[PDB]
Amino acid sequence: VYVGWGVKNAPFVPLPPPPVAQEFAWGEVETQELELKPA
Amino acid sequence: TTQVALMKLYKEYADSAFNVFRGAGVDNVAAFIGQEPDTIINQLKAYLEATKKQKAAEAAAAAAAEESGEEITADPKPHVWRFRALGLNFGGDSLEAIEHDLKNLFAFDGDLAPGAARDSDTSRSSFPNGDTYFGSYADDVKHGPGLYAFATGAGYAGEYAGGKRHGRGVMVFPDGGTYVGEFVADKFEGQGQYRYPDGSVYTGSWAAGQKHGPGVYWDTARGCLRGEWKKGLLVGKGTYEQPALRFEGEFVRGMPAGTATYTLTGHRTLDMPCFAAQHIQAEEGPTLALPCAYGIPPGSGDEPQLDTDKPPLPAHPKYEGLTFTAEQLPGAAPDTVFPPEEGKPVPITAVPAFSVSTGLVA
């Protein structure tokens, strides 16, 4: 038989604040025309 | 003068920086970047959708062609031929003695001046890998308003300087996220709103492509997280607010640690009869504050990834090394309403409110 409050006798950790997402990688870099030949 | 270049019979694809612009119906590029950001974002998303659909169709056609018949032997993209009647004089010894200008005259479609840097104000620019640009040039680089397609689906519309991004702009990335705000070089800087593909939104400060400074994050659990973030992670005193609770304390390397404080109110029994009569007419709600403290493994988080005899940081699904300690009584803190009033404008759609007078509205 079980008689008591429904609480477990284990160490309790309050859940930490939820994780933040991550941005996009940097395979999006502006391809640039090659600069003038200086003299 | 030895050579005269007197034509260019070029070819243009139906998806570039000169067709996202044309669909808008605005007068010029300064009127394309000057729209309200929502329509800019929608048009760039439509361009991304078009690119993805075209890639899928091309792959299917290639597989079918391999299955039976012969090779495609033809450009599958949609192309319309165009002709610039330009005439320029170049002085040299042979065709390879002006290579720069020649290949310059290959791609930049503006006001070509032999032996001079580009200065066109309505120029187009193709590129090797396939990405295209529409906008202004100055001193051989991009400078001013511009629209820019990455040929992978991504896209940018906004200001350019130094040949790169600078000033205010809007970007759409291939995954689905978007960004609206200021830019330095090719990465975020200053203030901006980033919207992630899952649904979360971050409306705050940025430094060199990472979250940095005062920040307000609004995750997918409809909770508000505020702090002073540093190099993509939250460090120092941070606050997390949920319709019934408010937790504030130190974070190190994105995970809680050190002396913290929980404050929350019993919302389950706000309508049940009180156990004491004097609580019936009192003004203090049923809110309690626990001065607790988290704990982290004694090696983890103490090293700022100086790349190991260091335990790993606890992960999301199950946190391995987090401890927790509360050895004092609660202190009966005052009431807390959910919308924090810091970061009051809520970017997320469905966010319920709370108060002692009225419980969870939604």
Swiss-Prot record, chain B:
Post-translational modification summary for this protein: Probably methylated by PRMT1.
Localization per record: Cytoplasm, Cytoskeleton, Flagellum axoneme
MORN repeats: 133-153, 156-178, 179-201, 202-218, 227-241, 247-263
Membrane spanning stretches: none
Disulphides: none
Region (Disordered), start-end ranges: 295-317
Biological role: Flagellar radial spokes contribute to the regulation of dynein arm activity and thus the pattern of flagellar bending. They consist of a thin stalk, which is attached to the a subfiber of the outer doublet microtubule, and a bulbous head, which is attached to the stalk and appears to interact with the projections from the central pair of microtubules.
Protein name, entry field: Flagellar radial spoke protein 1
Naturally occurring in which organism (per UniProt): Chlamydomonas reinhardtii (Chlamydomonas smithii)
Gene field: RSP1
Entire-sequence positions represented here: 445 to 814 of 814
